[PDB]
Amino acid sequence: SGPVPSRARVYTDVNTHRPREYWDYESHVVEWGNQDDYQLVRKLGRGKYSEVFEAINITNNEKVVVKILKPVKKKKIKREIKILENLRGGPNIITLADIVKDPVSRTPALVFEHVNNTDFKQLYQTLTDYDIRFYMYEILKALDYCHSMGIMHRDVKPHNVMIDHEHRKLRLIDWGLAEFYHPGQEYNVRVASRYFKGPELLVDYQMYDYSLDMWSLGCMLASMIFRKEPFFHGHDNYDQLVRIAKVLGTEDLYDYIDKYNIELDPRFNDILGRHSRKRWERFVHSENQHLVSPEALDFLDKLLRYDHQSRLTAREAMEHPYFYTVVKDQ
Ligand SMILES: NC(=O)Cc1c[nH]c2ccc(Cl)cc12
Ligand SMILES: NC(=O)Cc1c[nH]c2ccc(Cl)cc12
């Protein structure tokens, strides 16, 4: 009658063996700080959910990044804070230094460790083949850690990867979309950016898991190695599935729909058509060849799969020979 259920292949039950307070974020009490510890120095950007500022901690002149939240429901803020606290200190995770509240306007504001420069405008531009491997391996460290801590990031894309190319350091940021994985739980599919949503989000399969972040990572890698950003350039959510299908083929699409007994929105019944699975060589040209290799295409093929169950996990991804040179170098 309904969709066939699903469980993560790894880290399935790590949140069950935790004390309830670790993932029951609705019950978390926020420990506020004094916002008068801090002065804003200048603005750095503004995303969909917050404005971002360079700022200074006046007691100990420490330099800091301040994210002033546009108003969201109290429970999503408790979620983000709890996740950031759980992950603090893990590899390549942004560190949450404080959390403050404007006395007048009552707006919450997270305070983070300084890092500078973003993946955009330096992504498909200045990085060598070895850079891409190195930085991808650093992202995998973050994803494997957070998954092993029971947490889905759900918004992996270049805008949320802060790289500081001088010091070869990387932080995975904006955890406001992240969730705890619980076996059997049905999640909201209206997450992540259009170009990075996995097939499970596009077909509205709610019992997804960590492997969602591995579809996004595969999207990021495809755009970097082919120098085509975004790789899947959908007009909207329904067309986004069409763009994937024109690359991955429809056969595996309808195979995935049947294995999980997914009801396909009748909207799709006309735009998907029939498409062969294309070979990756179709995307290689003179301008991107120096970043493409058999290793990279093989690795990519194993991230971009319809069946979320069959994607490389993060730990498996780090064992792929695309990263042999990186691993030996540390
Ligand atoms: N002393 C202040 O209240 C300055 C200020 C205005 N708006 C903010 C938002 C966050 C943080 Cl940490 C500081 C500020
Ligand atoms: N949220 C952003 O993408 C804006 C931004 C620019 N530069 C940063 C550095 C650190 C952090 Cl947390 C955020 C930013």
Curated annotation (Swiss-Prot):
Enzyme class: transferase
Record field: catalytic activity: L-seryl-[protein] + ATP = O-phospho-L-seryl-[protein] + ADP + H(+); L-threonyl-[protein] + ATP = O-phospho-L-threonyl-[protein] + ADP + H(+)
Post-translational modification remark: Phosphorylation does not directly affect casein kinase 2 activity, but may contribute to its regulation by forming binding sites for interacting proteins and/or targeting it to different compartments.
Active site: D155 (proton acceptor)
GO biological process, one term: regulation of chromosome separation
Keyword Transcription: yes
Activity regulation description: Constitutively active protein kinase whose activity is not directly affected by phosphorylation. Seems to be regulated by level of expression and localization.
Region (Interaction with beta subunit): 35-40
Protein residues bound to ATP: L44, G45, R46, G47, K48, Y49, S50, E51, V52, K67
Gene Ontology CC annotations of this record: cytosol; nucleoplasm; nucleus; plasma membrane; PML body; protein kinase CK2 complex; Sin3-type complex
Keywords annotated in UniProt: Apoptosis, ATP-binding, Biological rhythms, Cell cycle, Disease variant, Intellectual disability, Kinase, Nucleotide-binding, Nucleus, Phosphoprotein, Serine/threonine-protein kinase, Transcription, Transcription regulation, Transferase, Wnt signaling pathway
Gene Ontology MF terms: ATP binding; Hsp90 protein binding; identical protein binding; kinase activity; protein serine kinase activity; protein serine/threonine kinase activity
Keyword Cell wall biogenesis/degradation found: no
Protein kinase domain: residues covered: 38-323
Subcellular localization(s) per the UniProt record: Nucleus
EC number: 2.7.11.1
Primary location class: nucleus
Organs and tissues of expression: Expressed in gastric carcinoma tissue and the expression gradually increases with the progression of the carcinoma (at protein level).
Described purpose of this protein according to its UniProt entry: Catalytic subunit of a constitutively active serine/threonine-protein kinase complex that phosphorylates a large number of substrates containing acidic residues C-terminal to the phosphorylated serine or threonine. Regulates numerous cellular processes, such as cell cycle progression, apoptosis and transcription, as well as viral infection. May act as a regulatory node which integrates and coordinates numerous signals leading to an appropriate cellular response.
More about this protein: Can use both ATP and GTP as phosphoryl donors. Phosphorylation by casein kinase 2 has been estimated to represent up to one quarter of the eukaryotic phosphoproteome. Casein kinase 2 has been found to be increased at protein level and up-regulated at the level of enzyme activity in the majority of cancers. However, elevated levels of casein kinase 2 are present in certain normal organs such as brain and testes.
Annotated disorder: Okur-Chung neurodevelopmental syndrome: An autosomal dominant neurodevelopmental disorder characterized by developmental delay, intellectual disability, behavioral problems, hypotonia, speech problems, microcephaly, pachygyria and variable dysmorphic features.
Family: Belongs to the protein kinase superfamily. Ser/Thr protein kinase family. CK2 subfamily.
Oligomer status and interactors: Heterotetramer composed of two catalytic subunits (alpha chain and/or alpha' chain) and two regulatory subunits (beta chains). The tetramer can exist as a combination of 2 alpha/2 beta, 2 alpha'/2 beta or 1 alpha/1 alpha'/2 beta subunits. Also part of a CK2-SPT16-SSRP1 complex composed of SSRP1, SUPT16H, CSNK2A1, CSNK2A2 and CSNK2B, which forms following UV irradiation. Interacts with RNPS1. Interacts with SNAI1. Interacts with PML (isoform PML-12). Interacts with CCAR2. Interacts with HIRIP3.
The protein, known as: Casein kinase II subunit alpha
Species of provenance: Homo sapiens
Entire protein: shown range: 2 to 331 of 391
